Structure 1
Amino acid sequence: VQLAHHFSEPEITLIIFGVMAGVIGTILLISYGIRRL
């Protein structure tokens, strides 16, 4: 018996991967902005 969560396993892992991709993209854009100005 497992506790019922609002997000299912595919939904929660998609959310986590999306937040991870946003963090990676933010880091890459920051690195792109630096070393140019």
Structure 2
Amino acid sequence: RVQLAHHFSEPEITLIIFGVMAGVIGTILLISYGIRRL
């Protein structure tokens, strides 16, 4: 798993973060709801 070519790439950085951010937060909310049962 070694990289090559000294330079920046994958400009979709923000996208990756946003996705994980939305998913993580989403699961938390849903999960928190299960514990309550209501």
> TM-score over 0.5 for the alignment?
yes
Name the structure where helix makes up a greater proportion of residues.
Answer: 1
Give me the TM-score of the superposition, normalised by structure 1. 0.64
Q: Percent identity?
A: 100
CA RMSD of aligned residues (A): 4.5
Q: After the TM superposition, which segments of 4 or more aligned residues of structure 1 sit over 3 Å from their partners?
A: 1-10
Long gaps (5+) in structure 2: none
Long gaps (5+) in structure 1: none
Give me the TM-score of the superposition, normalised by structure 2. 0.62
State how many pairs are aligned: 37
